[PDB]
Scaffold this active site. Structure first.
Site, PDB file in Angstrom:
ATOM      1  N   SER A  39     102.659  71.938  13.613  1.00  0.00           N
ATOM      2  CA  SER A  39     103.998  72.989  13.405  1.00  0.00           C
ATOM      3  C   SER A  39     103.378  74.325  12.779  1.00  0.00           C
ATOM      4  O   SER A  39     102.654  73.949  11.728  1.00  0.00           O
ATOM      5  CB  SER A  39     105.045  72.529  13.193  1.00  0.00           C
ATOM      6  OG  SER A  39     106.309  73.404  12.831  1.00  0.00           O
ATOM      7  N   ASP A  72     108.856  55.215  24.253  1.00  0.00           N
ATOM      8  CA  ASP A  72     108.440  55.497  23.096  1.00  0.00           C
ATOM      9  C   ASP A  72     107.123  56.351  23.137  1.00  0.00           C
ATOM     10  O   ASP A  72     105.934  55.644  23.493  1.00  0.00           O
ATOM     11  CB  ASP A  72     108.251  54.189  22.308  1.00  0.00           C
ATOM     12  CG  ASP A  72     107.523  54.363  20.992  1.00  0.00           C
ATOM     13  OD1 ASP A  72     107.660  55.399  20.423  1.00  0.00           O
ATOM     14  OD2 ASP A  72     107.197  53.187  20.277  1.00  0.00           O
TER      15      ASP A  72
END
Length: 330
Positions: free
Chosen positions: A199, A35
């Site tokens: 992004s 994770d």
């Protein structure tokens, strides 16, 4: 040193991935959920409330000659999906894919929430976010990667998640045969303890690319792709019959639909998520309403590039003094 381990989806939807981890002496092998959105290595154990264990493999520290109670240490964590767990702490030898750390904090669960109990395939979590998020008190503990780093050939690990198929986690090296083209690296902020990056935009299907900054985290422990409501609306508007259902808790679509791809930007590079990756199947057994793999982050407070996005790429988690993230197509 290096390590290399295969990671395997837990079910036919890729709801999560499990990776075998050797703990203790003699080794006890547990299948953990790696994770990159948390920083605790915790396991089902011989200390876990018996009614809260249902099929998981447990760590028994009394059977490990190298286990040592970390005196006074406790831990307690809550995840974005509302699940939780807590317990006490041992140190022990932990190995992943041939890579060994001695004195790793192994957080032994005394309590776990129903979500964990009900998932027989996950024996615990292995956190790979930054150690500043680790919940052990009064002495915060380091992640497996943090402990291994200095010994690694290169201070990196990579995630190569499969679509409906096994993949790989590598530690200490970049497998140049595992991706196509070049790896595009992008800046990381560690301010919130995550692998947080920006992004450069998105496209829906064969549509034009929209240049827009989207701050989010690379999180292998989250199934879906969570993005701003504007982006998500633009995606599902291209699917006939798709709608946001408050009763279901997100966007659903007719199971008869063909889903468009979704592209996200990494610098000047582009990662394409095929439409099939965005199908998470009937909302309930036999239903013709299917659950979408792109959902709104509104009310999470952060955008999350979860498995839906990450499994479309070869992803480098670069833990150099100034961390960065790399993405390649594959």
């Amino acid at each position: 040193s290096t390590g290399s381990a295969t990671t395997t989806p837990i079910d036919s939807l890729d709801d999560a991935y499990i990776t075998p981890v050797q703990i203790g002496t003699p080794a006890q092998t547990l299948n953990l959920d790696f994770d990159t959105g948390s920083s605790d290595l915790w396991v089902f154990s011989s200390e876990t409330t018996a009614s809260e264990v249902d099929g998981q493999t447990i760590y028994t520290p009394s059977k490990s000659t190298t286990a040592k109670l970390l005196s006074g240490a406790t831990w307690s964590i809550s995840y974005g999906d509302g699940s939780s767990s807590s317990g006490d702490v041992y140190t022990d030898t932990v190995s992943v894919g041939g890579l060994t750390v001695t004195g790793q904090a192994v957080e032994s669960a005394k309590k776990v929430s129903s979500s964990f109990t009900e998932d027989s395939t996950i024996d615990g979590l292995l956190g790979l976010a930054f150690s500043t998020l680790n919940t052990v008190s009064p002495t915060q503990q380091k992640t497996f990667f943090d402990n291994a780093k200095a010994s690694l050939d290169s201070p990196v690990f990579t995630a190569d998640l499969g679509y409906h198929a096994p993949g790989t986690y590598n530690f200490g090296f970049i497998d140049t045969t595992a991706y196509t083209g070049s790896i595009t690296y992008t800046a990381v902020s560690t301010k919130q303890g995550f692998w947080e990056w920006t992004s450069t935009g998105y496209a829906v299907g064969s549509g034009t690319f929209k240049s827009t900054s989207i701050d989010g985290i690379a999180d292998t422990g989250t199934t879906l792709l969570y993005l701003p409501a504007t982006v998500v609306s633009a995606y599902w508007a291209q699917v006939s019959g798709a709608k946001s259902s408050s009763s279901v808790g997100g966007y659903v679509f007719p199971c008869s639909a063909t889903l468009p791809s979704f592209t996200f930007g990494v610098g000047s590079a582009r990662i394409v998520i095929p439409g099939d990756y965005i199908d998470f199947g009937p909302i309930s057994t036999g239903s013709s309403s299917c659950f979408g793999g792109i959902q709104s982050s509104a009310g999470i407070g952060i955008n999350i590039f979860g498995d839906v996005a990450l499994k479309a790429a070869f992803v480098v988690f670069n833990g150099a003094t100034t961390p960065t993230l790399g993405f390649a197509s594959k």
